[PDB]
Symmetry: C3
């Protein structure tokens, strides 16, 4: 009950016109969307990587391949749920997740509760163990120019 | 045994005509950080880590850029109120770690003072607070000195 | 026992011609390598900073002109870092990390990096993790101008 481990996750996707904007499982109206072979859900990908990392199971690319017919059409919530199943099977219980989305636009505050609810459901966690934060990049860099969106995640687990 | 972790990120532009305040320390420099508050990028990152570890949202939720209450605000006062709310939520802080990334000025002479400020504001001994500082090895807008970034991690426990 | 602490680390180095690419102690075939005073192993630097941070010992810049470390490679420095963490009364519980590089492919080398780090930190493999991804062609990382590493470390004061 004291074998705690920490994991950390990072992801980024390009933001361009012509695709939907989906973050934390939430479709957000915007003139641009994230590019990636999946649904490009940068927040769920970062959290997934933090969870695999806390369990020392490698990373999201080692677990899911575009070539794998099991996951070919899978959205990022299905990937997060499978991640959590593998983390549990390796012997770990998740204690909490925290995260940050960095986007110059749109405003993400109205969507935070919905994202937290999706993530908590997918991880079978109480809502008060899941946190999502959001901020701009103060107009600096490709993030500040609206050319991508970044997500960071931290996860604490314990080996039971 | 109810431990929780949080992580924080912040960045502010470096501009002429502003005080440079990082970790609560007013640093002599021809430029300063631009923000609604005093724009203390390090304290904001730590504030976000603490709110995040307690699942209390983020700094924008508690101390909005849009609220005139916080124009020019002392970010140490914001950090102390953050810590008060984290305590009110049932959490004790176990440690904080952080990094400042900047091309200039030299931060080594100021790091110990930043650590002491953060420790005081969080009611922690110095040995549970850590401030790291580095350059971005000449890359990107940080390499060009256009802003300063801070990162933070916080461990809390629900008592 | 229960005095846990967390640390976090970040580093980035430029990719330059005429130098070997060494990440996680692994020499990787590539026409460029990382620039730095050391061998510029950006992954070991990030982990080193996370460990110093978790133990509240400052940072890599304060720890490392010293004739003990003049020509030291990054694994010797990681080992010395781990010594100083132990000196302060801390035991390492786990390390996690991410390498961000547009090229070359790091997947074939990850297992060796983890084994190198585990040996240097005197940890079992199941307490060390290395992740790797691209930057989706964004920014200086996406243009192949540098490689970034991030790390998180958990320690306990015994
Ligand atoms: C079936 C889906 O398989 C994959 C494979 C790689 C992969 N990488 C990411 S990332 N680098 O976090 O944008 S999400 C993803 C999904
Ligand atoms: Zn992704
Ligand atoms: Zn700020
Ligand atoms: Zn370095």
């Amino acid at each position: 009950s004291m074998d705690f481990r920490i994991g950390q996750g990072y992801d980024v996707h390009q933001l361009v016109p012509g695709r939907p904007l989906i973050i934390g499982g939430v479709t957000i109206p915007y003139e641009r969307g994230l590019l990636g072979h999946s649904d490009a859900d940068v927040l769920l990908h970062a959290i997934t990587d933090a969870l695999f990392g806390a369990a020392a199971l490698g990373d999201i690319g080692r677990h899911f391949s575009d070539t794998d017919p099991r996951f070919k059409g899978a959205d990022s919530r299905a990937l997060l749920r499978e991640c959590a199943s593998r983390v549990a099977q390796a012997g770990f219980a998740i204690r909490n997740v925290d995260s940050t989305i960095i986007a110059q636009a749109p405003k993400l505050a109205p969507h935070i509760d919905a994202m937290r609810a999706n993530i908590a459901a997918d991880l079978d966690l109480p809502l008060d163990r899941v946190n999502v934060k959001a901020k701009t990049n103060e107009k600096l860099g490709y993030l500040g120019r609206g050319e991508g969106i970044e997500a960071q995640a931290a996860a604490l687990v314990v080996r039971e």
